[PDB]
């Protein structure tokens, strides 16, 4: 229904309606805390396509990240920094995903969808309870979110030869002298 | 290393782990394969003695001798020699030797019961009321809105009547 | 080619026969779990891609849906009776279709299917 229209609107971010709304929200977020709880997603189509559900156990957290370089560029993405800061504030939650919501001259604002793995509404649902397993503790710190998957070069093809299965594992495999018993 | 030195000088007992494997190495039960499985024979020799195929893939090494387990056209149609748009979905219609093979065929070929699904009391009452007003005109029963609220097609109601034995 | 610290990355293989024993015991465990069944699934015959290996054939990943439909095996029953299915592969010619269809009817001719209960 309406989410198709919101997706098409989100695809025009310099149009008058979206530019006006982005500026008013940026003003409000700038005067709030750096990491603050958001009652509902400001972009429901984007949160919904990333796995956010209006169910107890799902939380949005807006976070501002200072933009710019670290001429040494920070190889870590600003979106990854956002998830890490939110993941430390909410150390009892699992970072599901995050998405861009706004940008200013000095900050870039992102919203992080988190999931409570101890809520019974999450532990009983076979679509989300994979995050209840202890192998998903702090996915944002190990490059296991979407930004982490992009920055580690985890894609198929000849362009991603040295990084598609892990860069350091590939380097250790190529630098290992294999001596068999019968040589 | 310091921990192991500590336990050597400690009076606390050495906790011996039993050799409990996650997966059993021999089949078990009261089925045919379990009573004819030799624990001192390999997979290939056991499947040879059964008369079955163990590996369906291409042979990957040499085998022991007697392994037997490691396996007109008017329109130019390549498939017309292959013959013997809906097929049966939940089963196949398949049309000296070792004793295990014959036992497996016998237990696979033995007749089974079907557990024919019956009908609920309310469905039988609905089909009965439908017969008491029209009798056999299944088209009129489909047209009836009062006695057939879910507007089911006359073919479905005829099939349900035939299953109920109400023709 | 010993410019780096290769001492810390030498892999010996003194556990080759032990790993062979482990692999054979894993196959035995698969046999124990799937007692009358073969431990392997049925796989199609495919042609090797390049011009260098075009002459020879090998085992594929799974049978095409058209091959299964032509052999008379339904798509949903096929993985439950030991046949591998690959939805990515296409036939593209009437000669791989006939070969893998012949393979599937040969498999059907030598199969003992048991009832559910």
């Amino acid at each position: 229904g309406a989410l198709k229209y919101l997706e098409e609107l989100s695809k025009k971010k310099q149009s008058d309606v979206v530019r006006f709304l982005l500026r008013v929200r940026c003003w409000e977020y700038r005067q709030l805390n750096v990491i603050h709880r958001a009652s509902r997603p400001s972009r429901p189509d984007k949160a919904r396509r990333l796995g956010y559900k209006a169910k107890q156990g799902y939380v949005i957290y807006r976070v501002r990240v200072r933009r710019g370089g670290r001429q040494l560029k920070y190889q870590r993405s600003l979106r990854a920094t956002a998830e890490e800061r939110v993941g430390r504030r909410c150390s009892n939650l699992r970072v599901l995903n995050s998405y861009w919501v706004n940008q200013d001259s000095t900050y870039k604002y992102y919203e992080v969808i988190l999931v409570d793995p101890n809520h019974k509404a999450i532990r009983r649902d076979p679509r989300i309870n994979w995050i209840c397993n202890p192998v998903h503790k702090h996915r944002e710190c190990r490059g296991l979110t979407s930004t982490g998957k992009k920055s580690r070069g985890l894609n198929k093809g000849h362009r991603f030869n040295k990084t598609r299965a892990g860069r350091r594992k590939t380097w250790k495999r190529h630098n290992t002298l294999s001596l068999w018993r019968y040589r | 290393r310091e921990l192991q030195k500590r336990k050597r000088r400690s009076s606390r007992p050495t906790i011996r782990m039993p050799n409990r494997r996650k997966k059993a190495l021999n089949p078990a039960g009261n089925n045919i394969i379990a009573k004819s499985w030799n624990k001192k024979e390999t997979l290939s020799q056991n499947y040879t003695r059964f008369g079955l195929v163990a590996k369906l893939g291409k042979a990957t090494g040499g085998t022991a001798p007697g392994n037997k387990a490691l396996l007109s056209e008017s329109d130019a149609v390549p498939q017309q020699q292959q013959q013997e748009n809906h097929i049966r979905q939940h089963d196949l219609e398949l049309e000296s030797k070792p004793e295990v093979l014959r036992a497996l065929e016998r237990e696979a070929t033995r007749p089974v019961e079907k557990t024919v699904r019956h009908q609920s009391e309310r469905e039988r009452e609905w089909l009965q009321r439908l017969v008491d007003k029209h009798g056999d005109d299944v088209a009129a029963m489909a047209r009836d809105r009062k006695l057939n609220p879910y507007q089911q097609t006359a073919s479905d109601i005829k099939r349900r009547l035939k299953k109920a034995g109400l023709l | 080619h010993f410019r780096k610290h290769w001492q810390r990355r030498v892999r010996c293989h003194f556990d080759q026969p032990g790993k062979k024993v482990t692999r054979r015991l894993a196959r035995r465990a698969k046999a124990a779990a799937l007692a009358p069944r073969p431990v392997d699934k049925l796989r199609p015959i495919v042609r090797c891609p390049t011009v260098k290996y075009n002459r020879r054939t090998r085992l594929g990943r799974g049978f095409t849906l058209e091959e299964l439909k032509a052999a008379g095996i339904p798509r949903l029953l096929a993985p439950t009776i030991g046949i591998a299915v690959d939805h990515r592969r296409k036939n593209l010619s009437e000669e791989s279709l006939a070969a893998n269809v012949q393979r599937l009817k040969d498999y059907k001719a030598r199969l003992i299917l048991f009832p559910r209960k």
């Binding site: 679509r127 | 396996l71 | 073969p38 439950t80 030991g82 299917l113």
Partner: peptide
Amino acid sequence: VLEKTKKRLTHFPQRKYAVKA
């Protein structure tokens, strides 16, 4: 499990079979 998985497992379970040599 989900209901779709339960339906698939109910009507198409893993079958018992044997390939004869």
